[PDB]
Structure formats: C-alpha cells, structure tokens
RNA sequence: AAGUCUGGGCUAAGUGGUAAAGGAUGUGGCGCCGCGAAGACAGCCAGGAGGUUGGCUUAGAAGCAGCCAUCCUUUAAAGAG
C-alpha cells in the first residue's frame, strides 16, 4: 500500500486520525489499489481485496467516502 | 529475600508456598522472593 | 477538607458509639459502596485521603459520592499541660460512623475498577470495611 | 416474568426462631386481608433478586390459594445487610400504585466526552392496573451533553399507566467525571 | 547520549559528581547546551573537543543530499 | 453446550451438501505449506474447500446423525479431513496424494475415504487419482 | 479432695498457656457461578501465517522508544501484537 500516497495526495500520517482528516478516497479508488501489487496479496477476490487497504488508510489518517 | 508482613504475588509468574511453617513467595525473578516476617 | 461552614456551638461532648447505623445503610446513588464494619470517629483528613485515592485510581472518569461528613468537632488539650482549666481546643472534625453505614459510593466505571478503588480507599480508613454492589434490596428502600 | 414462590402460614412462632431455621418472616396484605407468613430465605432471594419491587410474585399458600403480590417493603438488618422481614401486597383487580423500571437507552453525548450518566431514578412511581405492567420503560438519553437532565415530564409512557409523581422530578443527569487534573487545590 | 548516536567511553568520579566520557557525532549535539541542564536541574557541564571525522552511515549519507 | 453446536451445524450443512468427502492428516505442516495444499485444493477441486478442519468428535457425530455410514477409517489424530466432495470430486485427489509425498516426508497422508457414498479404503484412496 | 467418665465435632499451633491493621494454596465444613465424555483443567505434539516496515516520528523504531490508528484477510485459529 506504498502506492496510496499518490491517490489522495498526502505523504505523511495524521498523528491523531479518527476525527482529523487530511484527504479522502472513495469506494472505487480502493479497487484499483486492490489490483496492482495483487499477484502477491493472499486472497484472490476484489471485495476480499479492497477491505485490505480501506483500513490501511485509516490506520494513518485517511477515510473512506461512501 | 524481602521479609514482610504483607507478602503477595508480584508478577504473573510469582508462586506462594508455605514451608516449615512459614509463608514464602518464590519466583523466576530473584527480586520477587519473599518470606513473611 | 471537610468541616461545617458555621456551627451554633464550637465544641461538643464526646458521646458514644453504641448501636448499628441509624440511617444510610443502603446504596442510594452509585453502583458500588464501601460499608463500615466497625464503629469510629472518622476524620476529615481520613475521608479526604479516601477520596483522593479513588480519584487517583479512576484518573479522569466516574463519580465518587461521599455519604458521611465530619461535623463533630474534635478537641485537644495543648501538649504537656495538666488536667483542668477548661475544655481543650478544636483541632479538627470527625464523622461518627457505626457498623453498616455506606461511606462512599461509586458509579460510571467498571466492576474491576470500583473494586480496586474501594479496596484502596478502605486502606486509608481506620476500620474494617466491605465492598457492596446494588441489589434489589437497596432499590427497595 | 411471572414469578412464583412457596409461602407458608405462621402464628405463634418466634421470628428469631424462624430466622434461625432458614425462614424469613413476613406478612401479606391488602384492603381486604392480613396474614402472617414466612418464606424460605434462599428461595425468596433467588426470586426477589430479579423480581425486586417491579414484577408480580405469586404466593403459593399451603391451603392451595395462589395470590399475586407485589413486594411492598423489605426490612433490612442494618448491621448485617440481610433481609429481616418482607411485606407482600396482595394485588386486586383495581389499579394500584407502583414502581416500574427505567431502561436508559443509547449512549449519551456526555459520555464519549468524559462524563458520567447519573441515574437519579432507576424506576418510577405509576398508577396502573395489574393487568398491564411494562417490564421496561425506555428513555432516550442520547441527546444529553454533560450539564443536562431529564425529568418525568419527558419520558414517554405506554398506555396506561399514568405518572404518580410531579413531572418536575428529575430522573437523569450527565455530570462531569472526577479527573486528577483537578485535584491539586 | 545513546539517543544521540553515542559510543560511551566510560565514567569516573570528580567532585562527586560523576564524569561521563563519550564520542558523540557533533551533528547530534546542537540542543545539548541546555538539554543537559534540563536533565540535571542546573547542575551540569560538558566540554566537547573534536577527535576525528568519520563516514556517516549510509542511511544518512545517502539521504542528506536531498 | 456449546458454541460447538454452531460447529456441528455449519459442518453438517456443508457436509450434507455432497456425498464423497475424504480424510487426511492436515496439521503437520508450516503456514507456508499450510497455504500450499490450500491454494491448490481451492483450485484443484471446487469452491474454497480443501480441508474444512473441525473436530474428529464432531465429524463422527456429524457423519453419524446425518447418516453417511460413519467414515470408520480413523478420525483419531490431527485430522481435518479434506472435504473431497465439497470440491469437484475427481482424480484431483492426486493434488493431495502428490502434495505431501514429496514436500516433507509424509507431508499430507490420507486415512478415511468415502467414495460416491460407499467407503473407498486406505491406500485405495491415494491410488484413487494416481 | 473427686471421671485418666460417656457420646458427637474440631484443632497439630504446646494453638490452648496475653496483641492490631494486614498478609497467606493451613485445615475442616457450607454456598454460589464457569468449563466438562459434542473429551474440560494440567503437561506434552502441530500451527501462531498475511496486506505489512501499520502511517508518522527519526539516523533507524520492521508486532514491542513514543505521539495516534487498531480495519479486514486465506482461516481449525494466529493482536497491525
Ligand atoms: Mg507491600
Ligand atoms: Mg518457580
Ligand atoms: Mg465524655
Ligand atoms: Mg447521638
Ligand atoms: Mg481520633
Ligand atoms: Mg478538651
Ligand atoms: Mg483499614
Ligand atoms: Mg443488600
Ligand atoms: Mg428512608
Ligand atoms: Mg442473602
Ligand atoms: Mg476419657
Ligand atoms: Mg503452650
Ligand atoms: Mg504460649
Ligand atoms: Mg478458612
Ligand atoms: Zn514474580
């Protein structure tokens, strides 16, 4: 998920995420990401793949737009 | 040895023993040793 | 710490710890109480120690209810002086407390947390104390 | 929710005596009657502990009768925290005054913020026919920030079931939360 | 001082008072003027004399260039 | 008694959704290899069903009360029983019979074996796709 | 001086034969929950794997200096420890 820095813009964490947002990504920019470094991964699907960075983005300081 | 009126388990690996009339605490950790007294 | 804001009388006779508690024997605010197993004059400084202990263990969180209050003035003759020549001076205030009185109660916190706080505050007190929890029996009074 | 509990008549027996033997003296009554009874202490405990003053307990008398009661008061031994004696009010088909629980619903804004939900009332006085007790009564507390309260004036009410106390009577409050950053003063 | 990339040479008494001697990269020695006094409550002192240059670790020397 | 009852069901449901489920010593190997015979049988078969590991005690009551004879091969041992008909029951039992006879000595042996509806046999099972 | 009297129980400290907060697998007896032949507690034989170094921080903190986050995944199960 090193790739996630050039889809929302940021280059750094948020130090205190949860209430603080400093960027955003939607339901579909997670699927493209759920594809690139995916001959590796673990699973083989797309919705078993997208929920793998959809919370690896909130572990720093970026949310998911729905 | 810590000698005290109040002997207790200090860490999860601590063990309370009674020997020859006297309550001790024994432990992996040498600092945890206690005889009551 | 605790003491009356004003009194009609500066000093009062010692009285007598006969009896079970007159009142205050059920929990009435929180979820857990500390109840006294022995009679005593509990002092303000003691109550205050008891309190502070509880907050320092909660560390932001919870409500402490303090259900006794020291309004009996405690007198003492100046060191090294003889008998007589009048009643001594007020050096503090105490709460008369008899067995079965709920002294403190807590709320808004876990059982594994009130337990400890109350375990601790007991230690500051000069008597034996049991920890209780609300019951229907409480609710019913 | 329909609790029953075996209860036996007594006359000359000494309360001290019944008490030594596991039993808990008590009396059943209402506008029409008055009997001195006793119940096994641990049988009653298992029951009352969930029945409280809230749900009907049904008395299985030895003569065979089967009276629905509300527990009306429970005398405690002040020194030992034991129940000493029970009052059983024998429910008639008239409406009767009583206490019904308040379940506090949701999680207020004042919590999740630091604060504490002081539940000034954990049940409520209420006129109500016995043929419809609400084993609940919901109160939405979620709108509370620390500083706020809620009285009987709020609080829905099932039909029906009227209040039985001034709606000027506060029932909850969100107060701030102890905190060591106070203290030193 | 280990927080400042320091190899510690040893200790010794002085006025009792204990001395400490060690090589710290001057690089990680700016704040140490008043960062000492912060941790000895106005009871510290130090001297600092250049001993030698040496190749900074590649994590930095292959990074200070940016 | 217990939530080992929501273990009988969801393991008798996806058991009584077939007829030819086999059995093998499926614990022996590392979490590398234990995703190897797991990637493959999730391909060399059907669905994501290699070994749907559950208790020897449960499967035997399960393959008892849902009738299926009772795979009296041996439910004893670290046995997770590769649901062979929760996969496309074929000569893909070689996907197993080969996997462990090369990767770490005895690295995926078999035991019980129910073909179609009637029990196959011991070595009649690894020779049942080779 | 008069029972080495009778019957049931407890004590192993010479407790009896001077003391408190408090501490404690002492011992005997009650009581109440929880797990348990759909195989528990103890020991031991496997597994404890991914995205992934979780972002920042910083010279580096890769599950473990510390501000915070703490989702999901193939799963019998493997905490962003
Ligand atoms: Mg101590
Ligand atoms: Mg040991
Ligand atoms: Mg007097
Ligand atoms: Mg008086
Ligand atoms: Mg005093
Ligand atoms: Mg005086
Ligand atoms: Mg005390
Ligand atoms: Mg009570
Ligand atoms: Mg009253
Ligand atoms: Mg009781
Ligand atoms: Mg004899
Ligand atoms: Mg003696
Ligand atoms: Mg002696
Ligand atoms: Mg005991
Ligand atoms: Zn220890």
UniProtKB/Swiss-Prot annotation, chain C:
CDD domains: Ribosomal_L16_L10e
GO CC field: cytosolic large ribosomal subunit
SUPFAM superfamilies to which the protein is assigned, alphabetical: Ribosomal protein L16p/L10e (SSF54686)
Repeat keyword on record: no
Residue spans crossing the bilayer: none
Keywords of the record: Ribonucleoprotein, Ribosomal protein, RNA-binding, rRNA-binding, tRNA-binding
Any one GO MF annotation of this record: structural constituent of ribosome
Any Gene Ontology biological process: translation
InterPro entries named in the record: Ribosomal_uL16, Ribosomal_uL16_bact-type, Ribosomal_uL16_dom, Ribosomal_uL16_sf
Pfam families for this protein: Ribosomal_L16 (PF00252)
Record function comment: This protein binds directly to 23S rRNA. Interacts with the A site tRNA.
Family statement drawn from the similarity comment of this UniProt entry: Belongs to the universal ribosomal protein uL16 family.
Record's subunit section: Part of the 50S ribosomal subunit.
Protein name as it appears in the record: Large ribosomal subunit protein uL16
Gene: rplP
From Swiss-Prot, chain D:
CDD domains cross-referenced by the UniProt entry: Ribosomal_L25_TL5_CTC
Keyword Ribosomal protein: yes
Pfam families: Ribosomal_L25p, Ribosomal_TL5_C
Record keywords, A-Z: Ribonucleoprotein, Ribosomal protein, RNA-binding, rRNA-binding
Domain of life: Bacteria
Keyword Ribosomal protein applies: yes
GO biological process, one term: translation
HAMAP family: Ribosomal_bL25_CTC
Listed name of the protein: Large ribosomal subunit protein bL25
Organism: Thermus thermophilus (strain ATCC 27634 / DSM 579 / HB8)
Swiss-Prot record, chain E:
Compartments in which it is found: Cytoplasm
Superkingdom assignment: Bacteria
Family: Belongs to the TRAFAC class translation factor GTPase superfamily. Classic translation factor GTPase family. EF-G/EF-2 subfamily.
Biological function: Catalyzes the GTP-dependent ribosomal translocation step during translation elongation. During this step, the ribosome changes from the pre-translocational (PRE) to the post-translocational (POST) state as the newly formed A-site-bound peptidyl-tRNA and P-site-bound deacylated tRNA move to the P and E sites, respectively. Catalyzes the coordinated movement of the two tRNA molecules, the mRNA and conformational changes in the ribosome.
Full protein name: Elongation factor G
Residues of the whole record sequence present: 624 to 689 of 691
Swiss-Prot record, chain F:
GO biological process, one term: translation
Keyword Disulfide bond carried by entry: no
Modifications the protein undergoes after translation, according to the UniProt entry: The N-terminus is blocked.
Alphabetized UniProt keyword annotations: Ribonucleoprotein, Ribosomal protein, RNA-binding, rRNA-binding
GO molecular function: large ribosomal subunit rRNA binding
A GO CC term assigned to this protein in UniProt: ribonucleoprotein complex
rRNA-binding keyword on record: yes
Self-association state and partner proteins as the record states: Part of the 50S ribosomal subunit. Forms part of the ribosomal stalk which helps the ribosome interact with GTP-bound translation factors. Forms a heptameric L10(L12)2(L12)2(L12)2 complex, where L10 forms an elongated spine to which 3 L12 dimers bind in a sequential fashion.
Family: Belongs to the universal ribosomal protein uL10 family.
Function: Forms part of the ribosomal stalk, playing a central role in the interaction of the ribosome with GTP-bound translation factors.
Name of the featured protein: Large ribosomal subunit protein uL10
Native species: Thermus thermophilus (strain ATCC 27634 / DSM 579 / HB8)
């Amino acid at each position: 998920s090193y790739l996630i820095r050039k889809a929302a813009g940021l280059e750094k964490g948020a130090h205190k995420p949860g209430r603080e947002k400093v960027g955003r990504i939607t339901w579909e920019q997670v699927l493209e990401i759920a594809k690139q470094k995916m001959p590796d991964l673990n699973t083989t699907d797309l919705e078993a793949a997208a929920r793998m960075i959809a919370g690896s983005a909130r572990s720093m300081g970026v949310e998911v737009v729905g | 040895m810590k000698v005290r009126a109040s002997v207790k388990r200090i860490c999860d690996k601590c063990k309370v023993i009674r020997r020859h009339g006297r309550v001790y605490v024994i432990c992996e950790n040498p600092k945890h040793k206690q005889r009551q007294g | 710490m605790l003491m009356p804001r004003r009194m009609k009388y500066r000093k009062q006779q010692r009285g007598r710890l006969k009896g079970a508690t007159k009142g205050g024997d059920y929990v009435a605010f929180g979820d857990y109480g500390l109840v006294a197993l022995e009679p005593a004059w509990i002092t303000a400084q003691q109550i205050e120690a008891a309190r502070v202990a509880m907050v320092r263990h909660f560390r932001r969180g919870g409500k402490i209810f303090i259900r006794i209050f020291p309004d009996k003035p405690y007198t003492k003759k100046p060191l090294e002086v003889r008998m007589g020549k009048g009643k001594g001076n007020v050096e503090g205030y105490v709460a008369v407390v008899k067995p079965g009185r709920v002294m403190f109660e807590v709320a808004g916190v876990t059982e594994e947390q009130a337990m400890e706080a109350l375990r601790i505050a007991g230690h500051k007190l000069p008597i034996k104390t049991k920890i209780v929890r609300r019951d229907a029996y409480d609710e019913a009074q | 929710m329909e609790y029953r509990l075996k209860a036996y008549y007594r006359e000359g027996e000494k309360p001290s005596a019944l008490r030594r033997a596991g039993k808990l003296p008590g009396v059943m009554y209402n506008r029409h009657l008055n009997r001195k009874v006793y119940v096994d202490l641990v049988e009653f405990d298992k029951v009352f502990r969930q029945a409280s003053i809230h749900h009907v307990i049904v008395l299985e008398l030895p003569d065979g009768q089967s009276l629905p009661t509300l527990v009306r008061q429970v005398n405690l031994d002040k020194r030992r925290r034991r129940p000493e004696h029970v009052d059983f009010f024998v429910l008639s088909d008239e409406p009767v005054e009583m206490y019904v629980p308040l379940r506090f619903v949701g999680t207020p804004a004042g919590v999740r913020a630091g604060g504490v939900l002081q539940e000034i009332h954990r049940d409520i006085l209420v006129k109500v026919s016995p043929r419809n007790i609400p084993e609940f009564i919901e109160v939405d507390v979620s709108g509370l920030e620390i500083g706020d309260s809620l009285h009987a004036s709020d609080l829905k009410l099932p039909p029906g079931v009227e209040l039985a106390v001034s709606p000027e009577e506060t029932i909850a409050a969100v107060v701030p939360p102890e905190d060591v950053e106070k203290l030193a003063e | 001082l280990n927080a400042r990339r320091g190899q510690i040479l040893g200790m010794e008494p002085r006025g009792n008072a204990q001395v400490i001697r060690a090589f710290v990269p001057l690089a990680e020695m700016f704040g140490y003027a008043t960062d000492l006094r912060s941790k000895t409550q106005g009871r510290g002192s130090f001297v600092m004399f250049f001993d030698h240059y040496q190749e900074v670790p590649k994590q930095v020397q292959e990074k200070l260039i940016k | 008694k217990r939530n080992v009852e929501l273990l009988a069901t969801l393991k008798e449901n996806l058991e009584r959704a077939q007829g030819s489920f086999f059995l093998v010593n499926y614990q022996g190997l590392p979490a590398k290899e234990t995703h190897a015979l797991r990637q493959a049988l999730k391909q060399n078969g059907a669905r994501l069903f290699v070994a749907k590991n559950t208790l020897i005690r449960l499967a035997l009551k399960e393959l008892g009360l849902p009738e299926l004879d009772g795979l009296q091969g041996p439910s004893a041992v670290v046995f997770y029983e590769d649901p062979v008909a929760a996969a496309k029951t074929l000569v893909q039992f070689a996907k197993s019979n080969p996997k462990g006879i090369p990767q770490v000595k005895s690295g995926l042996l078999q035991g019980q074996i129910l073909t179609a509806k009637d029990v196959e046999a011991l070595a009649e099972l690894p020779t049942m796709d080779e």
